[PDB]
Design a protein around this ligand. Sequence first.
Ligand SMILES: O=S(=O)(O)OC[C@@H]1O[C@@H](O[C@H]2[C@@H](O)[C@@H](CO)O[C@@H](O[C@H]3[C@@H](O)[C@H](O)[C@H](O[C@@H]4[C@@H](O)[C@H](O)O[C@H](CO)[C@@H]4O)O[C@H]3COS(=O)(=O)O)[C@@H]2O)[C@@H](O)[C@H](O)[C@@H]1O
Ligand code: NA
Length: 506
Amino acid sequence: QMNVIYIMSDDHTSQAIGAYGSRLAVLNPTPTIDELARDGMLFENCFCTNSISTPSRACIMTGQYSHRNKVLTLDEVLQPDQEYLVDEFHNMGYQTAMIGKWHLGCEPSHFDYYSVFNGHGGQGEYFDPTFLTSDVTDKKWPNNQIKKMGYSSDIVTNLAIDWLKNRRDKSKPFFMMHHYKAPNDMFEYAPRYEYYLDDVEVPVPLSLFDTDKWGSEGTRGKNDSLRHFIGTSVSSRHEIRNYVMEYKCNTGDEMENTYLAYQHYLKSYLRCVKGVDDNLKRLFDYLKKEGLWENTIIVYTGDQGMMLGEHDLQDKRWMYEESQRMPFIVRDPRCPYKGAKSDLMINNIDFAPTLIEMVGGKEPSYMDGKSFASVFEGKKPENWKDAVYYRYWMHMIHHDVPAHIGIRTENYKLILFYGRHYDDKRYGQKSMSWLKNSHKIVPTLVSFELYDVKNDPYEMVNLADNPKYAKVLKDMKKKLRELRKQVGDTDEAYPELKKVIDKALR
Ligand SMILES: O=S(=O)(O)OC[C@@H]1O[C@@H](O[C@H]2[C@@H](O)[C@@H](CO)O[C@@H](O[C@H]3[C@@H](O)[C@H](O)[C@H](O[C@@H]4[C@@H](O)[C@H](O)O[C@H](CO)[C@@H]4O)O[C@H]3COS(=O)(=O)O)[C@@H]2O)[C@@H](O)[C@H](O)[C@@H]1O
Ligand code: NA
């Protein structure tokens, strides 16, 4: 029976992995992960269904869409009763371990062992983190706390290794979720990486300085009336929260300021990536010397992508390619296609069924996702989807990103910005509640964006208003509407949203 280690890093986006060949690949940002890929399978078209941490982690644990599992935003929590992935591995006879960032709000009580970040509401701290652990038994969760000194990524690795070495019943297979809190948003990298990339310019995306054909009234207002209101930015564009502000650039030329903020942003981020890649080398070295390399399935992914200055955007939440796509790599020592790529359209909701089937189980029938385990034996799964659904619910909060739904096929992406919050109490409250002068949560404009992702992979050119694409628009609207129905995301419980979205979809 196969062991499993599911490795997931916070906000580690596909641009920031060498094997995915972005403009950043020339920097060799992840040699260890690229090596994993060279001896594994790399998935080109893996998409988050809702790109923030807690909802994506709920989708992963439950195999269900946000609207089914009900963890819509960062404001909602999982129930322990919903820890279905770990329940399914328990039921197959595995010992189970949860290591690192949990961020699901409830106790990981369905695990045999856990040791998870508790500080700053589940995000944990980059230095001297505290953890909650099933080993502290004289206190009840969430007060069963320990503290460790030093850099968080190194400690996370140490927790996994210590469990493997001293705690696991070596007579049983194990299933472990190993979640790094880096690189995250903070980007508080370890001091040993201080001069990593000091002498190199990070490739800059053209879209950081040119957004001429991108977006729509839903993301910019009419004639850019909302250009300083929607979408936190790298440049000074966003009037409340941007990296020119945060990094205090003041050269006298705003374009220069944007450039320097991009450079600091990216260098800090990539130093955090480098910490994770180095720690992965430690982990894999241990697994190999312990005799576990050839009987352990290894997954490496990130909970969602992240905008690294593309279109002068930051963070995630958007359904734009860099935020929607998750890097996803699987090394199954049994799989013979080593260093292979798969273009299958998959979602984070498909992770649990696939893993379960990979070890001999059956894809759970109460899950929304399905198992593509057959790809590792060289067969496309039966009747598999050729398009993915996306919905971001958390209207405006934190980063002034409007709520939207969307469909992405192999050729086109259609986004519908509906600009509403599902809890109308929120209207009028601050989007960024720690800021005296925050914008307020208000309804934004309704609009469509259409991208040819085959010919315009960087989503530079919104096509929705080009008469040459009217039929395409029509077809994609039909598909969006039908997909929304197939997945049961029809908004009966939120009639305001239902009215707006149904009207927009003709
Ligand atoms: O998807 S992720 O990868 O997890 O990234 C999401 C994240 O979202 C925003 O940051 C918020 C995020 O970390 C969230 C937890 O999921 O926590 C929010 O901060 C809250 C608390 O954790 C903080 O401690 C702080 O509140 C305390 C406050 O409770 C106390 O009264 O006083 C304290 C004094 O130090 C402090 O004010 O702030 C709250 C804010 O909560 S709220 O925004 O929901 O109303 C994080 O802000 C993004 O900003 C981030 O970039 C990232 O996208
Ligand atoms: Na994240």
